[PDB]
Design a protein around this ligand. Structure first.
Ligand SMILES: Nc1ncnc2c1ncn2[C@@H]1O[C@H](CO)[C@@H](O)[C@H]1OP(=O)(O)O
Ligand SMILES: [Cl-]
Length: 174
C-alpha cells in the first residue's frame, strides 16, 4: 500500500506556540493559509509515493545513520513567491543538520525516489498560498532548541485537513 512519506525534524510545543503567536501578530488572515500548529516541522527529505518494500528498506538505511544531536536556532524568516510560502529558517544551518539531510537524501536517491532537483534549503513553512509579497519581520527571540531525533512521517489529506502521521522515530548521538 503506497504512501506519501517524508523525513522531518519536529518542534517542541513551547516553540510551536511562540511561532503561531508571532504569526498571528504579523500576518493577517488575507496574508495566506496558516499551517496548523501540530503540522509545523522542518523537512529533511521528501520521498513521495513509496511502496511498503521500499519503506522497509529506507527505514533500515535510516537506522544505520549514526550522527550526534545538534542545536537549531531560528534566526531567519522570509518568503518564496514562486512557491507562495512564508517560512521560518536559519542563516547558518548547523553542519549536523546538513549532514543528516544530504545523507537521507542520498539514501532516497539510491532507493529510487525522485529528488528535489533543487538545493536543500532548510525551512519551516508558516503560511501557504501566500501569493502576494508582504513584509517579513525577524523571528521571535530565542527560538533555540536541542534536536534529539528525526521522524519518518506519512502525509495524508482527509476531512478538509492535512495530517502527518508518525511511522518511526530515530534518536541521534546513538
Ligand atoms: N512534491 C512534493 N509533494 C508534497 N510535499 C512535498 C513535495 N516536495 C517537498 N514536499 C515537502 O513535504 C512536506 C509535507 O508535504 C512539506 O513540508 C513540503 O515542503 P514545504 O513545507 O516547503 O511545502
Ligand atoms: Cl496545515
Amino acid at each position: 500500500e503506497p504512501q506519501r512519506l517524508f523525513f522531518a525534524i519536529d518542534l517542541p510545543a513551547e516553540i510551536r506556540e511562540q511561532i503561531i503567536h508571532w504569526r498571528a501578530k504579523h500576518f493577517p488572515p488575507e496574508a495566506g493559509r496558516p499551517v496548523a500548529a501540530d503540522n509545523l516541522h522542518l523537512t529533511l527529505a521528501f520521498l513521495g509515493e513509496v511502496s511498503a518494500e521500499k519503506e522497509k528498506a529506507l527505514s533500515l538505511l535510516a537506522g544505520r545513520i549514526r550522527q550526534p544531536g545538534f542545536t537549531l536556532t531560528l534566526d531567519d524568516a522570509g518568503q518564496w513567491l514562486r512557491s507562495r510560502v512564508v517560512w521560518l529558517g536559519m542563516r547558518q544551518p548547523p553542519r549536523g543538520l546538513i549532514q543528516l539531510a544530504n545523507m537521507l537524501r542520498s539514501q532516497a536517491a539510491r532507493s529510487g525516489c525522485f529528488q528535489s532537483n533543487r538545493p536543500f534549503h532548510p525551512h519551516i513553512t508558516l503560511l501557504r498560498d501566500a501569493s502576494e509579497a508582504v513584509t517579513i519581520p525577524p523571528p521571535g527571540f530565542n527560538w533555540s532548541y536541542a534536536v534529539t531525533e528525526f521522524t519518518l512521517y506519512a502525509s495524508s489529506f482527509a476531512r478538509g485537513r492535512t495530517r502527518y502521521t508518525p511511522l518511526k522515530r530515530w534518536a541521534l548521538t546513538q
